[PDB]
């Protein structure tokens, strides 16, 4: 039922900007937060930021405050992730997930995940 | 107006300081030793002809109130810089229950009193209605506490207002001589500090009136207020010396 | 920022045996009896899949073999029995205070 | 003169060779290990129970608003409440609620059905969200809801709760509309009489015990936090640290902010008196804000450091002398520790044998170089 999709891969020139989508379906998009996790190839998981589609409330990580510019489009139920000033260290796979953000239930649990996008900067 | 000597009363503790057999000096508003205290009579029975006089005495940075009524006829003290709804004013009421501290803008009537009536069913004097003020505006602060007056025993209620703080100090001591304040030394224990934060210039004593006093007939046959009498003294800024025992109870003072 | 360490990094467990994964938190995660630690399983070439939420409850659709424990700084995840298709990377995540951080990850070998 | 106490004496007297005697080279001080802070039991609790646990809640279209200020927001009771079904906070971490301060707190309470709980959130749509209770996009606060079938429903059907079914315009954020004007659904005017194109804007909820959780009444309380430039009036209550005795610490008892060691006392204070002073107008003892006891406050032990040395041309060994301080608060310790009325001297073996006095120490104790 619940389906979350991301583009397969993206190629961007160094010093440019890339804007990729996070398409969610099968559930009410506005009622669930959209969080983002960065995973370097062969490394662990790093959190970037989370956004609530209803109202556009954002919360960016201190490390990625100047790197991540995140916007959502509730009309298409899709979240757009924009990256700027990309370098060789930014070549990684980015995963968008959802969490209900309920202290009673699941708190920050990420039950559903997107397929992810392999971003290569060269 | 009748005048009576102060007779070395009204010494109260400095705010929250303790010593042990230590002689220490303080500089604050205190009652004069061997002062001259106006023994005003609020109501005198003259039939039971009404003699109702509660003169609006200025506060003048402190008042020393002494009550000798055994029926708790004295019930409240009204404070205000102008005693109108233009500025906030302090209202004190002391039933045989929790005290109601009321500080709001009040259009005060000529004769403030708390309407109390005797009920045939309950056989008790519960308050009928409040007829002290017309309106209550800017009601910011409301405090509740146990009654001050409880149970021939002289009571000392010294009142001050400093730094936007209203402070009261109380002491209860039996007296054989009702007419005259005894030539004995008694401390005034701190009780509670109130952050009223309003200017006070005029001090007025409130006397609760029974339903008989509030009957259409002026004569109050059921309840008599002739025994009501309140002492009033005025404080001044002179250094005093206090002696503390090992218990910490103030025993004597010298001007 | 709370850092999470997972040991052992490389673990080998035979068929039907018990696999032990421990996640250590640099700061306390318990909050009024609630521990906010999550265990994720990431198959190669696929997104991580949540197994245990709040370090003590089983996510729907996850086999009962996966089980977690621990509190405050130390958390332990136990898988029993361990099957052939359990070869993946397990990550522990804390969420008591922002920013949320993940563990270093562990490798399971059959 | 940082090497050894004998070198310290050489440093003080500015001479390589020092004659036999006693010299004050420095002073000893006990640095406090840590700081301690205690506050009394907090009584200015915010009326959380008054808002959350109220017998009667108003309708969603007439949601009650409660302003909370000049008190401490104790969320511990909210955390310990296990009957809550939804606890989502926007713009604030639920675990950080007690650690954050807000200028003003507004409490909104109403009753809605189970399936309409999700409508109380920023950016949501629906009947309740648009016509009964609308939240702003940048709303900062938490949404709390729980089942209320036992109290908001009865056998005969509780219709006391109403929702705004029809409204000409969507509600603005934080807008409470209680108008009962007849809704005009067509060109024909209503003139205060409902008809074909005129319907009541409010519809009574049908609450029954057997409706189910999907259609059961839910008590919803919404707390909104605003951050303005005015001084904060809602802050988390302070935490009282564990009491310490017989150990020198830094104590701040509601503003005393003194230094020293706290010890159990025997003196009794006035029921109102908290802390006392000496003749010299210095802090003497403080009463516990938590319990009812008196603790003596002596200042941290400190005194001059003395060195006992014989003639450097005769010997090269020295014995430290710590005056006016007992050996417990202490060349390092562990080498023939001896205690005297003058203090704790370290480095000399005490002997009962009595000789003629050579070097002054105090209280009838004299030290000399012998076998
Ligand atoms: C002072 O006290 C005397 C009696 O001691 C009294 O006659 C007099 O009226 C009082 N007041 C003044 C202003 O003298
Ligand atoms: C006592 O008087 C007060 C007036 O402030 C009133 O509120 C209270 O109910 C009275 N107590 C009774 C009637 O028992
Ligand atoms: C202080 O109180 C104690 C206990 O009642 C008493 O024994 C002692 O005599 C008092 N000190 C005085 C009266 O100076
Ligand atoms: C009502 O009960 C207690 C306080 O009486 C507390 O848990 C909270 O204020 C309320 N509980 C719920 C579940 O609403
Ligand atoms: C404060 O609460 C504790 C815990 O119940 C209690 O032991 C202590 O007596 C209380 N102190 C005051 C002054 O209320
Ligand atoms: C004292 O020092 C002098 C050096 O100036 C030395 O000649 C003498 O022997 C020394 N005497 C003793 C008793 O140490
Ligand atoms: C050190 O001080 C005195 C000695 O005069 C005595 O209380 C004890 O020996 C020591 N104090 C302690 C251990 O608290
Ligand atoms: C010194 O006197 C003490 C006193 O009891 C005794 O215990 C100790 O044995 C004596 N030592 C010598 C060497 O006389």
Residue numbers in the entry:
A (entry chain H): 1 to 9, 11 to 30, 35 to 59, 62 to 72, 74 to 111, 111A, 112B, 112A, ...
B (entry chain B): 26 to 71, 74 to 178, 187 to 290
C (entry chain L): 1 to 31, 34 to 57, 65 to 72, 74 to 80, 83 to 109, 114 to 126
D (entry chain A): 291 to 620, 636 to 676
Paper excerpt:
Here, we characterized mouse mAbs elicited by mosaic (M8a mAbs) or homotypic (HSW mAbs) RBD-nanoparticles using both structural and functional analyses, showing that mosaic nanoparticles induce potently neutralizing antibodies that cross-react between animal sarbecoviruses and SARS-CoV-2 VOCs. Structural analyses revealed neutralization mechanisms, potentials for intra-spike trimer cross-linking by IgGs, and induced changes in trimer upon Fab binding.
M8a-34 also bound and neutralized most sarbecoviruses across different clades and SARS-CoV-2 variants and exhibited a similar competition as M8a-3 and M8a-31. To map its epitope, we determined a cryo-EM structure of M8a-34 Fab bound to the WA1 spike trimer at 3.5 Å resolution, revealing interactions of three Fabs with three “up” RBDs that were modeled using an M8a-34 Fab-RBD crystal structure. M8a-34 Fab interacted with the RBD through all three CDRHs as well as CDRL1 and CDRL3. The M8a-34 epitope was similar to epitopes of other class 1/4 mAbs including M8a-3, M8a-6, and M8a-31, which overlapped with the binding epitopes of CR3022 (class 4) and C118 (class 1/4), again consistent with its binding and neutralizing properties and competition ELISA results. M8a-31 and M8a-34 recognized all RBDs in the ELISA panel. M8a-31 and M8a-34 were less potent against SARS-CoV-2 variants but were more broadly cross-reactive, correlating with ELISA profiles. M8a-34 and HSW-1 both had long CDRH3s (16 residues), and M8a-31 had the shortest CDRH3 (9 residues). The class 4 and 1/4 epitopes of M8a-3, M8a-6, M8a-31, M8a-34, and HSW-1 were buried when RBDs adopted the “down” conformation but fully exposed in the “up” RBDs. Measured distances in spike trimers complexed with the M8a-3 (126, 130, and 159 Å), M8a-34 (107, 110, and 150 Å), or M8a-28 (144 Å) Fabs were too large to permit intra-spike cross-linking. (G) M8a-34 Fab-WA1: open trimer conformation with no potential for intra-spike crosslinking by M8a-34 IgG.
